[PDB]
Amino acid sequence: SRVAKAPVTVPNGVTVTQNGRQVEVKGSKGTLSFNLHALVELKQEEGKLQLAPAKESKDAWMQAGTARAVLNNLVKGVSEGFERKLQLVGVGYKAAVKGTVVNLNLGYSHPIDYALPEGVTAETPTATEIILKSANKQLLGQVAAEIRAYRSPEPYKGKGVRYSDEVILRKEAK
RNA sequence: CCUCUGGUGUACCGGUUGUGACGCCAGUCGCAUCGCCGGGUAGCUAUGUUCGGAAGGGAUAACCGCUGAAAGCAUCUAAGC
């Protein structure tokens, strides 16, 4: 359980407060919440944080490791946040951002308007690239996946919506 | 369901054959598959008319995922979604 053994350090501004099972993290970007499992327990000494099993059970160890990973991700999100920089590749494929709704022309008869969930932001340096920024890694990844679902990449020519840091399998007809 | 198009419609109207009768003519009636033939009001009816199988919401199958440890990596999963 090396991940669980490895502790996490508060940056400075963000503050973590535990009431009951619920745990709240307040930061410059925003406020986030988490639910602790029964077996794992948390102790905050200095800016350092420690999570350990209540019992030596392997279930408790794995839950403590998962809690450590989640809390580290939450701390990173509140301190800085994350960006996903999705990209669209094709001919005639375009995108734009207006308010909280992103309008995409992806080769279908009708343009697709996607309403971003609260807590995420989108900007468009170019019609072929969208930058999605958020403090919640899980929600941000979910939104990115939903957007890419509309037109995921196709193998023969690579047309569609692709993550830049993704390997596209390529195939040739006949 | 019967406004329209039709069918039927032996208590509605008419044309006509044989015979009998009402004293006779004229005019009528009975019987002959409603004697036979031509139409036909309401009602019932289809082949006639109108309408319907919508659109939505929740959970979910195969499948596709997000984040994530066991197992420093990886992983749709054991937590969560």
UniProtKB/Swiss-Prot annotation:
This protein's record includes keyword Disulfide bond: no
GO cellular component: cytosolic large ribosomal subunit
Keywords associated with the record: Ribonucleoprotein, Ribosomal protein, RNA-binding, rRNA-binding
GO MF terms held by the record: rRNA binding; structural constituent of ribosome
Pfam families, per database record: Ribosomal_L6 (PF00347)
GO BP terms: cytoplasmic translation
TM regions (residue ranges): none
HAMAP family: Ribosomal_uL6_B (MF_01365_B)
Function: This protein binds to the 23S rRNA, and is important in its secondary structure. It is located near the subunit interface in the base of the L7/L12 stalk, and near the tRNA binding site of the peptidyltransferase center.
Similarity field: Belongs to the universal ribosomal protein uL6 family.
Assembly behavior: Part of the 50S ribosomal subunit.
Listed NCBIfam families: L6_bact
Entry protein name: Large ribosomal subunit protein uL6
Biological source species: Acinetobacter baumannii (strain AB0057)
